[PDB]
Amino acid sequence: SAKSRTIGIIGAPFSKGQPRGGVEEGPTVLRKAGLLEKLKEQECDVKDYGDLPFADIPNDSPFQIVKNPRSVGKASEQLAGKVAEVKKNGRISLVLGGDHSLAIGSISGHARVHPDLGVIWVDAHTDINTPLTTTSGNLHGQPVSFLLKELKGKIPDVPGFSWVTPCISAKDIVYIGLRDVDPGEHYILKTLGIKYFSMTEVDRLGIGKVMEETLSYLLGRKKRPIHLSFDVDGLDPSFTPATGTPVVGGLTYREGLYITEEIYKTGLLSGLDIMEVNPSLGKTPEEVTRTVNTAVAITLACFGLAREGNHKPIDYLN
Amino acid sequence: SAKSRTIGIIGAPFSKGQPRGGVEEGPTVLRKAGLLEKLKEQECDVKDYGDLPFADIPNDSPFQIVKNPRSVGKASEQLAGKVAEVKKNGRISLVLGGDHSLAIGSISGHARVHPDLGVIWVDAHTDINTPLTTTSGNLHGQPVSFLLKELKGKIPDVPGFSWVTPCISAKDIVYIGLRDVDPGEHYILKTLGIKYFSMTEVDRLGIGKVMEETLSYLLGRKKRPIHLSFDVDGLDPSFTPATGTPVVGGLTYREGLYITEEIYKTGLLSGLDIMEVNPSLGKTPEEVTRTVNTAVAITLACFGLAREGNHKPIDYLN
Amino acid sequence: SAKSRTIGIIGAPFSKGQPRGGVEEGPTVLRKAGLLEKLKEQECDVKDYGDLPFADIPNDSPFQIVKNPRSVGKASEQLAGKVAEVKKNGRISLVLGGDHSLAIGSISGHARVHPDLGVIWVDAHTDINTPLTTTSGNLHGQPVSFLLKELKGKIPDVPGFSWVTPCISAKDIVYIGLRDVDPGEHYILKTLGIKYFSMTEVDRLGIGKVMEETLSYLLGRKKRPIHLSFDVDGLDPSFTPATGTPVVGGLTYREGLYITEEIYKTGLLSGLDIMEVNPSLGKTPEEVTRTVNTAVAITLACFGLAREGNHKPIDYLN
Ligand SMILES: [C][C]([N])C(=O)N1[C][C]([C]/[C]=[C]/[B+]([O])([O])[O])[C@]([N])(C([O])=O)[C]1
Ligand SMILES: [C][C]([N])C(=O)N1[C][C]([C]/[C]=[C]/[B+]([O])([O])[O])[C@]([N])(C([O])=O)[C]1
Numbered sequence: 001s002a003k004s005r006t007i008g009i010i011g012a013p014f015s016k017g018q019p020r021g022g023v024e025e026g027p028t029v030l031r032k033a034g035l036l037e038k039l040k041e042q043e044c045d046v047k048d049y050g051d052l053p054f055a056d057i058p059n060d061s062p063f064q065i066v067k068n069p070r071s072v073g074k075a076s077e078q079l080a081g082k083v084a085e086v087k088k089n090g091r092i093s094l095v096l097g098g099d100h101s102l103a104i105g106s107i108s109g110h111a112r113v114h115p116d117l118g119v120i121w122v123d124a125h126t127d128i129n130t131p132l133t134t135t136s137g138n139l140h141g142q143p144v145s146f147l148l149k150e151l152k153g154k155i156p157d158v159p160g161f162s163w164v165t166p167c168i169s170a171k172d173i174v175y176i177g178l179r180d181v182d183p184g185e186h187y188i189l190k191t192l193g194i195k196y197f198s199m200t201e202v203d204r205l206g207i208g209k210v211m212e213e214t215l216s217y218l219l220g221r222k223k224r225p226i227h228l229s230f231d232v233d234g235l236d237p238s239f240t241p242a243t244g245t246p247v248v249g250g251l252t253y254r255e256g257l258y259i260t261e262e263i264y265k266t267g268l269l270s271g272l273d274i275m276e277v278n279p280s281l282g283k284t285p286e287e288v289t290r291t292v293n294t295a296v297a298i299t300l301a302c303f304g305l306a307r308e309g310n311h312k313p314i315d316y317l318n
Numbered sequence: 319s320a321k322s323r324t325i326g327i328i329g330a331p332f333s334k335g336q337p338r339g340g341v342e343e344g345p346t347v348l349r350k351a352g353l354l355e356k357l358k359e360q361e362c363d364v365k366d367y368g369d370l371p372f373a374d375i376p377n378d379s380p381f382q383i384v385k386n387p388r389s390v391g392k393a394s395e396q397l398a399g400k401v402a403e404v405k406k407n408g409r410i411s412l413v414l415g416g417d418h419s420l421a422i423g424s425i426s427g428h429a430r431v432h433p434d435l436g437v438i439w440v441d442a443h444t445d446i447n448t449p450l451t452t453t454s455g456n457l458h459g460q461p462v463s464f465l466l467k468e469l470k471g472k473i474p475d476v477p478g479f480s481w482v483t484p485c486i487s488a489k490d491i492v493y494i495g496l497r498d499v500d501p502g503e504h505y506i507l508k509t510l511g512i513k514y515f516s517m518t519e520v521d522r523l524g525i526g527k528v529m530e531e532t533l534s535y536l537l538g539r540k541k542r543p544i545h546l547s548f549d550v551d552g553l554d555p556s557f558t559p560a561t562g563t564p565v566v567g568g569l570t571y572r573e574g575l576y577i578t579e580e581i582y583k584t585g586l587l588s589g590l591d592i593m594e595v596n597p598s599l600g601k602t603p604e605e606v607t608r609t610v611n612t613a614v615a616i617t618l619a620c621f622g623l624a625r626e627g628n629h630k631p632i633d634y635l636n
Numbered sequence: 637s638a639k640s641r642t643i644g645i646i647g648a649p650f651s652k653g654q655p656r657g658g659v660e661e662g663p664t665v666l667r668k669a670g671l672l673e674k675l676k677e678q679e680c681d682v683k684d685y686g687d688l689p690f691a692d693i694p695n696d697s698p699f700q701i702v703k704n705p706r707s708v709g710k711a712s713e714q715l716a717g718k719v720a721e722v723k724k725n726g727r728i729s730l731v732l733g734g735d736h737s738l739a740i741g742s743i744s745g746h747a748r749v750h751p752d753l754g755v756i757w758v759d760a761h762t763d764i765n766t767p768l769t770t771t772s773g774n775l776h777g778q779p780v781s782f783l784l785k786e787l788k789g790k791i792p793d794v795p796g797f798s799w800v801t802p803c804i805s806a807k808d809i810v811y812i813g814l815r816d817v818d819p820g821e822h823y824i825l826k827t828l829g830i831k832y833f834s835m836t837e838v839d840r841l842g843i844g845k846v847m848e849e850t851l852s853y854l855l856g857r858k859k860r861p862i863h864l865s866f867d868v869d870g871l872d873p874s875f876t877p878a879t880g881t882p883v884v885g886g887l888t889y890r891e892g893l894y895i896t897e898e899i900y901k902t903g904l905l906s907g908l909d910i911m912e913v914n915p916s917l918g919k920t921p922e923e924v925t926r927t928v929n930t931a932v933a934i935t936l937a938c939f940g941l942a943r944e945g946n947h948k949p950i951d952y953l954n
């Protein structure tokens with residue numbers, strides 16, 4: 001009934017944006033934690049659109065050092081289609097990753113219906129390498145380069161990506177959580193003047209001021225739909241250890257919930273990605289449940305679960 | 319000699335406000351950690367009034383779903399008597415819990431001598447369910463409902479509680495640490511306009527501003543005695559794991575000491591409860607000592623132990 | 637090439653300022669973690685001046701209760717000589733401890749070349765006991781007393797220390813991280829009016845304001861060289877467990893990097909001590925690497941490694 005609680009869940013069991021198998025189980029483990037039931041418990045109208053079937057593309061030799069380009073491009077193409085569908089149905093898209101390369105699809109699909117969207121990107125990483133600046137060749141470290149209009153002429157024709165039209169400007173994204181930024185990425189960040197709150201900023205200002213500044217920046221001029229792309233490695237590995245590229249000194253669990261509580265309260269969340277949960281990379285069973293529980297907690301905050309408490313519009317003293 | 323260092327210790331080895339055995343050992347384990355000796359070491363005049371003898375009340379069938387009502391009511395009745403005695407003797411009452419239902423007794427007894435008291439309630443929970451809104455039936459989740467004048471006509475005649483007169487108004491309490499609030503409790507909170515700093519607030523503002531706001535709110539108008547009711551589950555379970563209702567994302571150890579340092583420095587601490595330590599619920603021996611050491615640290619801050627250091631009024635360079 | 641990236645590394649494998657063997661391995665373990673290579677990777681001109689050879693002084697009976705005075709005095713004498721040499725060569729002195737008594741040498745040597753230096757002292761402890769106020773007799777808890785001009789007439793003639801001339805005034809030092817301060821030390825702190833940010837202050841103000849205040853205080857009047865004496869026990873034992881005098885409730889890893897990032901950005905870092913790493917005191921191998929990695933991270937921040945990222949002056953998009 002509430003627009004900020006009307007939800008379309010898409011599972012994206014995809015791993016070929018990076019080397020480690022296991023991230024493709026993210027949707028399964030999140031679902032098995034009761035994600036859908038818990039969403040319903042807090043007065044959300046929840047439709048599960050299922051897990052996308054990503055066809056194996058067996059012939060997918062690298063483009064220069066960029067790995068699995070056709071698989072990664074196609075998986076994002078399919079996802080873009082599905083996110084657009086969900087958005088046309090009037091729902092907030094909830095993408096369960098899967099590796100972060102999929103943001104190319106998620107944001108693209110979203111932007112088809114709401115071209116005015118603004119992006120909040122929570123991550124240890126900027127994920128803004130181009131196919132030419134990357135040294136790893138892993139496409140989960142490149143999705144932002146593909147989306148940004150200002151970088152149009154710097155992205156080569158990579159097989160699998162001819163469908164992509166960049167759909168956001170440098171001014172339309174804010175990073176929170178940065179702490180492992182490659183030199184080329186830092187060059188891009190400073191050159192394009194992208195708004196960011198690295199861990200230094202968070203330390204300096206506190207998460208309160210960070211969120212105030214993030215939302216004034218994105219929404220001050222006029223209201224418009226928010227796309228939150230949440231990489232669980234933005235949180236410290238003491239909260240989300242079961243992930244492929246952990247970096248120490250991250251955002252706390254509290255900081256994670258603050259971010260998402262504040263976004264929820266704007267009323268403008270329109271797209272959400274919960275990315276990079278890799279249950280195979282927990283050192284123990286408890287590391288897996290710790291990671292998955294944290295991801296579920298972050299997601300529930302996005303759709304209105306508040307630490308101060310929640311109540312329905314009735315008189316509980318009657 | 320100093321009024322903020324003149325202390326009356328009461329042990330309240332009581333568990334029937336909740337289901338888990340073990341909380342009744344809180345006083346023993348706190349004492350065995352050297353609590354009394356450590357208090358004396360920092361220039362406190364310490365009187366130990368012993369552990370109250372709580373008579374078994376074998377016939378105590380539930381009142382509707384409310385469990386052990388007569389035991390819980392009687393234990394608080396006895397405690398109220400003892401706290402009043404300590405207060406009449408000019409001492410700061412230090413109640414060693416025991417489960418949080420005992421706050422009914424502690425605050426009631428305190429209020430007999432100082433009816434103008436203000437309460438600071440540190441906890442993951444609001445503990446403000448009535449006998450009618452509770453879904454657990456555990457009376458440690460209800461003490462605030464019994465104390466609040468505004469809820470007088472909403473508390474049924476529960477066996478064991480006919481001695482209770484509500485002694486505080488909605489304006490006379492501040493919550494810090496909230497992060498697991500039942501819908502009915504949230505309704506009560508918003509309806510009565512009670513001042514609270516949930517973890518969201520703490521994240522937003524920082525503990526510094528939280529304490530400034532808490533003390534201006536309670537003491538701005540005029541000075542008056544402070545009652546700090548400290549549930550160790552207000553701190554994150556990484557600091558106080560040995561407790562019955564842990565909730566992740568709590569106040570840090572530093573935040574715990576900041577709160578209590580600031581209260582100590584008002585000069586107005588008059589009543590203290592150190593509640594819900596349950597040594598039986600540590601997963602390991604180290605979890606027990608970690609919990610107990612944290613509780614002792616919090617208590618020592620309340621009576622003047624400062625992280626910057628302390629010295630006696632002499633010339634140490636002579 | 638850059639003055640804030642021009643470095644002279646001195647190893648100070650010395651332990652006799654305190655009781656626990658193992659701190660003398662600090663330089664070895666830090667070096668084995670790739671400290672020198674990592675410094676070079678971020679465009680630093682790095683000269684390794686080697687580990688100082690500290691001659692055993694077998695006849696070194698205590699001066700009253702002060703232990704190993706001649707060894708401690710001589711080790712600092714040698715270090716002062718070496719730091720002065722490095723400073724004359726135009727380099728930032730990087731001292732790898734070793735116990736904190738060595739700061740007597742490091743700061744003394746530094747002050748020979750730059751008598752206007754200001755000191756930032758990061759530590760759980762004030763390390764300002766005199767030979768007469770100390771109750772432990774360990775000289776790593778006394779270096780600041782030896783350096784401070786205002787305490788000249790309160791330091792007895794301790795064997796090994798006749799070479800010392802106090803070289804800083806009470807106004808020339810700022811403490812960050814304090815949480816275990818002896819009564820005599822607190823007396824000295826308040827008497828001399830030394831600027832400090834205990835953990836209470838950090839909690840109150842946030843590390844952002846702390847660093848702003850620290851740098852305005854030291855540098856507002858005029859620019860001058862900074863000496864950062866970093867005791868790894870200033871960080872919480874959850875980050876730097878392998879150390880001789882851990883104290884819970886310390887500065888976070890993030891807070892550690894914030895401090896050092898901000899100092900680096902002044903352009904005025906002139907002297908650095910990385911002290912009290914004791915690999916023998918890790919409970920496990922992982923506690924050792926955790927400690928050493930944290931120390932290396934802190935050091936790299938001091939010479940320009942930034943969480944937001946770093947890039948060379950080129951066009952990475954070409
Ligand atoms: C292994 C490599 N040193 C790394 O940590 N990086 C990881 C990072 C990409 C991280 C992707 B993410 O989705 O986890 O944010 C990176 N910038 C890249 O492009 O591969 C480099
Ligand atoms: C088990 C239950 N889901 C719970 O966590 N709660 C625990 C909480 C009461 C906590 C009492 B305390 O003293 O630990 O704060 C509660 N509101 C109640 O009334 O039982 C509900």
Ligand SMILES: [C][C]([N])C(=O)N1[C][C]([C]/[C]=[C]/[B+]([O])([O])[O])[C@]([N])(C([O])=O)[C]1
Nearest residue numbers: 736761763765772774776777818867881
């Ligand atoms: C063992 C003793 N209770 C202690 O913790 N202290 C340790 C502290 C000295 C710490 C030296 B440091 O370099 O670790 O900061 C101290 N002030 C002293 O003078 O010995 C007392």
Ligand SMILES: [Mn+2]
Nearest residue numbers: 100123127231
């Ligand atoms: Mn990412």
Ligand SMILES: [Mn+2]
Nearest residue numbers: 124125231233
């Ligand atoms: Mn990442």
Ligand SMILES: [Mn+2]
Nearest residue numbers: 418441445549
């Ligand atoms: Mn409670």
Ligand SMILES: [Mn+2]
Nearest residue numbers: 442443549551
């Ligand atoms: Mn509680």
Ligand SMILES: [Mn+2]
Nearest residue numbers: 736759763867
């Ligand atoms: Mn020290």
Ligand SMILES: [Mn+2]
Nearest residue numbers: 760761867869
């Ligand atoms: Mn120290």
Ligand code: NA
Nearest residue numbers: 231233245276
């Ligand atoms: Na990731």
Ligand code: NA
Nearest residue numbers: 549551563594
């Ligand atoms: Na509790």
Ligand code: NA
Nearest residue numbers: 867869881912
């Ligand atoms: Na130390």
